[PDB]
Every structure is written in C-alpha cells, then in structure tokens.
Amino acid sequence: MAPSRANTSVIVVGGGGTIGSSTALHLVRSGYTPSNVTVLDAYPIPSSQSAGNDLAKIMGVSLRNPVDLQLALEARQMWNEDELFKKFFHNTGRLDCAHGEKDIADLKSGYQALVDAGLDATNEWLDSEDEILKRMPLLSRDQIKGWKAIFSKDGGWLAAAKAINAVGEYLRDQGVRFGFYGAGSFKAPLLAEGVCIGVETVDGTRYYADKVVLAAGAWSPTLVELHEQCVSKAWVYGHIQLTPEEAARYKNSPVVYNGDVGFFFEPNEHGVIKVCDEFPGFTRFKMHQPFGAKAPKRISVPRSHAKHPTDTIPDASDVSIRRAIATFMPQFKNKKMFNQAMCWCTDTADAALLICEHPEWKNFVLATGDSGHSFKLLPNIGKHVVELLEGTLADDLAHAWRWRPGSGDALKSRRSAPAKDLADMPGWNHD
Ligand SMILES: *Cc1cc2c(cc1C)nc1c(=O)[nH]c(=O)nc-1n2C[C@H](O)[C@H](O)[C@H](O)COP(=O)(O)OP(=O)(O)OC[C@H]1O[C@@H](n2cnc3c(N)ncnc32)[C@H](O)[C@@H]1O
C-alpha cells in the first residue's frame, strides 16, 4: 500500500521557480511532512534563471480559456488576503491600452469578457486619451492619440522575486529540504517497472521519493520528451534609472500595457523602471536530447542569462523597447537601458497549462506550460498541482491541463505569429 500523506515523499524539480515553489508551499500547507519534501533547482530559490525572479509582474485578470476565471479569482483573493503574499501586491490598477482598429476591437471584446465574468465593478472602459490621462496623467497626450483602455481598479503589479523569496523562507523555516547547483540540476527520473521512484542530478546525486513533480518552466521540454506540447520562447526587458525626483512623480502609477507597444511599471524602491515590449517571443532551436526521446530532436532550448550573463537582447528588441520608452515616457526617450536580458517561458498550443501525470512514468507529474501568463498564479497554482498528485483535481481543470500532444502548434500558440528564432535576431550574444 502507498504511504499516507504524512509519509509521502515528493521531489519538486524546479522548486526554486514559480510553479515549483507554489507546489512546495501547498504540499506543506496540505499536510505533507516538510522534511519529506525536497526542492531541487539549478539555482537557489529564487532561481537566477526563473522567469519569476523579476522586479515586477503585472497582476490582472485576462480570460483566454474558461478555466482562467477560477484561477484568476483565487490568485486575486490570495494576493489581497494571504499574509505570506499580501505585502508584494501593489494594487495600483492596470491600464490595458490599444490603438488601431484591430487591437481596439479585440480590447472591446476583452472588456466584455471581464464584465461577463462578473468583474464589471472593478473594470472601466476608457474611450479617449483624456480618460486614460485621468488614471495616468504622467502619460503624454501627444503619444497616446486615439488610444483606448480598460482600467482594472483591482489590478496592479507584483514584486515577483520578493514573493518567491518569501515562499523560500517559509519552506526553509518549515524544514523543507533543498538541493541546488550540481545537487539540484535534474537530468533524469529514476524508473523501476515503469514507476518513477526518484531522480538523478548532473553531479550524479540520486534522490528517492514516492512522487516527482517537474516544474522546470521553459526547461521542461528540454529535460523530458513532451512531443512539442510545450515550445519555449524568450521575452525581453530592460531597466532605466530615474532620479529620486523623477521617481517620486511616478509613485503609485498604474501598470501601463499596450499589446502593440509593451508595458512598464512604477519605479521600485531603487528608482528603477522595468520596461518590456510585446511580441510573439523568440525560440532558440538546437539539437538536444530530452530524457525519453527516441530520435534526434531539434527543440527550443533556453539560452539562459544566468548561464550566459554577458548575453543581452536582440538589436531589434533594443529598438522596440526604446520605441516603447519613447511612447510611454517621451521625456526619458534618451535614457540608456541596462540589465537588458532575455526571460524564458514555455507556450502550449492553447495557452492553458500542462499539469498532468506522465502517461508512461507513474508518479512523475508534469507542471509546466506557463504560456507566459502565470506568475500571477504563484499563490494558488501549487494547490491544484497537489490536487492532481492526489487524484482530486476538478474535471474542468484536469481536462484543460491534460497530456495533449495532439492539441496543435505551440510555436504559434495563441499569439499573433510563430516565434522567430534568436539565430535570426542578432545582437544578444557577446561570447
Ligand atoms: C519572460 C517574462 C514572463 C512574464 C512577464 C514578462 C516577461 C519578460 N510578465 C508577466 C506578467 O506581467 N504577469 C504574469 O502573470 N506573468 C508574466 N510572465 C510569465 C511568468 O513569468 C511565467 O509564466 C512564470 O513565472 C513561469 O513559471 P514556471 O514555474 O513555469 O517557470 P520558472 O519560474 O522559470 O521556473 C522554472 C524553474 O525550473 C528550474 N530548472 C530549470 N532546469 C532545471 C533542472 N535541470 N533541474 C532543476 N531545476 C531546473 C529553473 O532554475 C527555474 O527556477
């Protein structure tokens, strides 16, 4: 007979990242024994290369699939009410803007989706640049002519790295086991009679456990064979430095987002604004053999900034990010970004998660497919990974997250185009 929860060991691979750390957290909250939970990561939580290890992420509701609503409401409640998480949600509002007929029409539909989801009280439609300037007067009326916007009063931004770090502290305090670097870098599941009984890391260290979760984000499909259910892509950011005087003006600013332009955040406590552009992401295809592959594989393998910290971003990205600064913050259009880096996610075809047991390897569970939209689910997602581990995951969640190699083309996913490849977008490499 299988051990009871109190005696069930679980290895969480990628446990220094977003979904992994959440999974570890909820294992403990769910009454697994902390010392029976092992978090393994290539880098100490919060992992240097985790997409969650960031200054700032957007908190907001975005409804791409039906299951999105439930997950978003859970997340919102916890960012507002959970003592572990509350202090890292800055409820400054979210300004989701569009310009041009196509983008504006899509926004109008997005707005109505939010209403129909029951969020009318916390979302308003802004039908002119004047309405927009009321929620964010530091925008230039020159630059945002003909823009419209949804303002989500209930949105804002998340101090991402800090939130994960507080999860790490909690796990540490509770007695969770850690292995990092060589001791934490997953290479293979250990298998017996078609059952997963642990993992081996690059330094040869073996961990034995009743259950294994693979929450390795953009590395997941590089680590085990996922038949292109996930395709990993990079987005880009840079930082600009404000004087204390300049920063003070932008204090408590709503997040500003435009799908055709990018997005930026109020200054952190160091006077630093993070800016991203928006685009369909970049692959970096190469030859690589994930565990369980039965043929030569060309797949998108993250070019990790943590591994290659001299890397920057493509020249085209430097250009697009600068035009974003020019548009959003024209008075700053002449600042030089620094800390420019690529940040890695993995897209499924339908942009829903992949959270499911491996069809072959009993007790090995996938928890990835973040599809670039999942940091906000830090608080709650781990709970459902536990439900899946335990066989209690709701049918609608279970279906949406299921093993589905047949599902479609992740390279394009739900985005405007197939991702281009870093090989064809020069200027990021300085080896
Ligand atoms: C890139 C990006 C993503 C992003 C965003 C802006 C950018 C530039 N803006 C967002 C926003 O405003 N709001 C939001 O909700 N999400 C946003 N995203 C996406 C978000 O960052 C990601 O969807 C999410 O963080 C992904 O989480 P996940 O847990 O899937 O991935 P991770 O945090 O990267 O964790 C992966 C971990 O796995 C470890 N790893 C890798 N290889 C190994 C091996 N071999 N062994 C053990 N561990 C491994 C990594 O170290 C990492 O910690």
Residue numbers in the entry: 1 to 431
Lines from the paper:
N-valyl-histidine derived from proteolytic digestion of the N-terminus of the HbA1c β-chain. This study reports the X-ray structures of the wild-type and Asn56Ala (N56A) mutant of Phaeosphaeria nodorum fructosyl peptide oxidase (PnFPOX) to elucidate the residues responsible for the oxidative half-reaction. Fructosyl amine oxidases (FAOXs) are FAD-containing enzymes that catalyze the oxidative deglycosylation of fructosyl amino acids such as fructosyl valine and/or ε-fructosyl lysine, which are the degradation products of HbA1c and GA, respectively. As members of the FAOX family, fructosyl peptide oxidases (FPOXs) are also known as candidates for diagnostic enzymes. A covalent bond is formed between FAD and Cys343 of PnFPOX as observed in amadoriase I (Cys342), amadoriase II (Cys335), and EtFPOX (Cys347).
N56A showed decreased oxidase activity compared to the wild -type, while its dye-mediated dehydrogenase activity was higher than that of wild type. In PnFPOX N56A, Lys274, and Asp54 approach each other, and the water molecule is displaced from the W2 position such that Lys274 forms salt bridges with Asp54 at 2.92–3.35 Å. The relocated Asp54 also forms water (W3′ and W4′)-mediated hydrogen bond with His239 and is stabilized in this position. However, with the movement of Asp54 and Lys274 in PnFPOX N56A, the corresponding space no longer provides enough room to bind with a water molecule (W2). The analysis of the protein channels of the structures showed that the W1, W2, and W4 positions in wild-type PnFPOX (W1′ and W4′ in PnFPOX N56A) are in the main oxygen-accessible channel. In PnFPOX N56A, the movement of Asp54 and Lys274 blocks a short and plausible main channel observed in wild-type PnFPOX (blue dotted path with arrow in Supplementary Figure S6). Although the oxygen could be accessible through another alternative long path instead of the closed path in PnFPOX N56A, the elimination of the accessibility toward the short pathway might result the drastic decrease in oxidase activity compared with dye-mediated dehydrogenase activity. Comparison of active site structures between wild-type PnFPOX with bound acetate and PnFPOX N56A revealed no significant differences. The observed increase in dye-mediated dehydrogenase activity in PnFPOX N56A can be explained by the decrease in competition between the dye mediator and oxygen. Our structural comparison revealed that Asn56 in PnFPOX has a crucial role in assisting and stabilizing the oxygen path involving Asp54, Lys57, and Lys274 in terms of oxidase activity. This comparison also suggests that Asn56 in PnFPOX is essential for properly maintaining a plausible main oxygen channel and oxidase activity involved in the movement of Lys274.
